[PDB]
Structure 1
Amino acid sequence: RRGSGVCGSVWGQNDIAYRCRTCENDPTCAICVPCFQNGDHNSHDYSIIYTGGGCCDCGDETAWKPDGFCSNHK
């Protein structure tokens, strides 16, 4: 989308990333592995995802709760 503090980092079709059902705005949202690990999802309902690729929504509050942002993306 257009506009300018978001990861937006990108993974391929057979690259892993993370889904977190506690932090996501909806089921199409996801974050990269570095941003998941530098955040805290203890007790959240998260899974590793294997398919589809994506751009990291870490730092983007239309797609991800701010409580769920990693330490590098406020």
Structure 2
Amino acid sequence: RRGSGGGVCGSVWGQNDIAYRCRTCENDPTCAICVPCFQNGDHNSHDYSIIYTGGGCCDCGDETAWKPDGFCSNHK
């Protein structure tokens, strides 16, 4: 199966790449979205943080990993 199937970002991170955690939007504490997806969505007043990913894939557009209100303009 493909990582961007079903309208999901799936941008792939290297081990030391930064991304965003958003405690307001996440399904669980391992979820995260890429900086572009964060910047093209609405997380005003959310409890978000820049994190080091340890690799992985962006969850934006995946409703089983991230609340849809937290999707960016390209995956909403």
**How many residues are matched?**
74
TM-score, normalising length: structure 1: 0.92
Q: Which runs of 5+ in 2 are unaligned?
A: none
Residues 45-54 or 16-25, more deviating: 45-54
The answer as to whether partners of 2:18 and 2:51 remain within 8 angstroms in 1 is: yes
User: In percent, how many aligned pairs have the same letter?
Assistant: 100
Instruction: Report how far residue 27 of structure 1 moved.
Output: 0.2
The answer as to whether partners of 2:21 and 2:33 remain within 8 angstroms in 1 is: yes
Instruction: Report how far residue 2 of structure 1 moved.
Output: 6.6
Q: Distance in 2 between matches of 1:45 and 1:51?
A: 17
Q: Which runs of 5+ in 1 are unaligned?
A: none
Residues 54-63 or 2-11, more deviating: 2-11
Instruction: Report how far residue 54 of structure 1 moved.
Output: 1.7
State the superposition RMSD in angstroms.
1.7
- Regions of 4+ moved over 2 Å: 1-4
The answer as to whether partners of 2:60 and 2:71 remain within 8 angstroms in 1 is: yes
